[PDB]
């Protein structure tokens, strides 16, 4: 059985970045080179591996993380980066081993008048740990006075919608992102090039 990859890349609904979706890829024929020439990708960059030299490797598990961000935030889905997405939404480790794949989805994810379904976290008391997920909706206390569950002075709703529109500039258009992390554990390898 070939690795269910079209299920991730061709999923109808994609997660909001703050609530990024994980799919675990199990024991299957991992064919990596065909993927790299499966569609026109605006981003295909790998970290400690090649698109062709992966077809001679074995791993315990592959994790496929998927979400939507705007074009000018794709740069943030890389080791060592900063910004709202890397700090408070989706963090890659320093020693990351995987690929980051992205494509423009303005044909799909943009609605006229705005698609307000996609959220990102604007405020957090501290940066996320690598592969951390925060789905909390606590009002963000920037002040000394407590927020009683209601936004106000010094009390900020922590999430914001992108509001993707078709006429938006390239940097502001929605981009679908798939992140493939490659794992090794003290257990038999399951996914192989």
């Amino acid at each position, epitope marked *: 059985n070939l690795c269910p990859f079209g299920e991730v890349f061709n999923a109808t609904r994609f997660a909001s970045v703050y609530a990024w979706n994980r799919k675990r890829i199990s024991n299957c024929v991992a064919d990596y080179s065909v993927l790299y020439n499966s569609a026109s990708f605006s981003t295909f960059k790998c970290y400690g591996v090649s698109p062709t030299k992966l077809n001679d490797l074995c791993f315990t598990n592959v994790y496929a993380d998927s979400f939507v961000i705007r074009g000018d935030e794709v740069r943030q889905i890389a080791p060592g980066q900063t910004g709202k997405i890397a700090d408070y939404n989706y963090k890659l480790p320093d020693d990351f081993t995987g690929c980051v794949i992205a494509w423009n989805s303005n044909n799909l994810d943009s609605k006229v008048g705005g698609n307000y379904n996609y*959220l990102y976290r604007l405020f957090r008391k501290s940066n996320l740990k690598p592969f951390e997920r925060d789905i909390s909706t606590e009002i963000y206390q920037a002040g000394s*006075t407590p927020c009683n569950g209601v936004e106000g*002075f010094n009390c900020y709703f922590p999430l914001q*919608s992108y509001g993707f529109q078709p006429t938006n500039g390239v940097g502001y258009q929605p981009y679908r992102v798939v992140v493939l992390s490659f794992e090794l554990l003290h257990a038999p390898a399951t996914v192989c090039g």
Partner: antibody, heavy 125, light 108 residues
Framework: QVQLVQSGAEVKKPGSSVKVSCKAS????????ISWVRQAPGQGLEWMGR????????NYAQKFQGRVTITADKSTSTAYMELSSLRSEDTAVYYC??????????????????WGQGTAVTVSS | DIQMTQSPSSLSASVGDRVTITCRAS??????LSWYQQKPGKAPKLLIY???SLQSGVPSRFSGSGSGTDFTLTITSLQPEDFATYYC?????????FGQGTKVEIKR
């Protein structure tokens, strides 16, 4: 030209509950908070609470906590205010109003820009 | 809870007048201050937000100012359509309390 259309007038006995609807029309508002404000006859305005429809997050003034529930159906773009253990003092016109909550629209400071037409609720035996 | 006290409770004015309504907060509220108009049997309508910003489509005879606790709504060249009740509302913190209102009546 987004309007907010509320359900009709209601008469209710003491101790019962009322549920009032608020429907977005000429739009499907998803960027906005929905507040509920009430006005007793001859009296001022009183903020009851708000819902953030997108995530179904609702919070209420201390005064109404325990008795009030605000919900939103995302598909219909309908918000609901249910008030329970009704008392004659709950006789009022109830307003829904659309306002802001997001940092992008900070410069409104949560002002309520579009109001429903109101719902007269009469509580009496 | 922040208390909002409006004054005067009501005032009488003639078409053409310049009218001032004040709202005092129990503490400093920055610009978390809005002004609303209400006519008998009708929903309130937003005039001013952020203390000073004129709401889109509202006549420019309405304006707001204020600093700290003290806020004012001014109607410069009062027209018949402007006789109404006016409410301030703070949105600084829960609950988002309103002033008790100011009725602008016709002088005779």
């Amino acid at each position: 030209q987004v309007q907010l259309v509320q359900s009709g007038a209601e008469v209710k006995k003491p101790g019962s509950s009322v549920k009032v609807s608020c429907k977005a029309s000429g739009g499907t508002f998803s960027n906005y908070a929905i507040s509920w404000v009430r006005q007793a006859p001859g009296q001022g305005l009183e903020w009851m609470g708000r819902i953030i429809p997108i995530l179904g997050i609702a919070n209420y003034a201390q005064k109404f906590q325990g008795r009030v529930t605000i919900t939103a159906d995302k598909s219909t773009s309908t918000a609901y205010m249910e008030l329970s253990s009704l008392r004659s003092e709950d006789t009022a016109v109830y307003y829904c109003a659309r306002g802001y909550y997001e940092a992008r629209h900070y410069y409104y400071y949560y002002a309520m820009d579009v109001w429903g037409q109101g719902t007269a609720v009469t509580v009496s035996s | 809870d922040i208390q909002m006290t409006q004054s005067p409770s009501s005032l009488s004015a003639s078409v053409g007048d310049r009218v001032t309504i004040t709202c005092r907060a129990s503490q400093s509220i920055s610009s978390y201050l809005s002004w609303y108009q209400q006519k008998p049997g009708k929903a309130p309508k937003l005039l001013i937000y952020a203390a000073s910003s004129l709401q889109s489509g509202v006549p420019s005879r309405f304006s707001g100012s204020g600093s700290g606790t003290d806020f004012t709504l001014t109607i410069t060249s009062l027209q018949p359509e402007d006789f109404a009740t006016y409410y301030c509302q703070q949105s600084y913190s829960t609950p988002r309390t309103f002033g008790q209102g100011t009725k602008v009546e016709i002088k005779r």
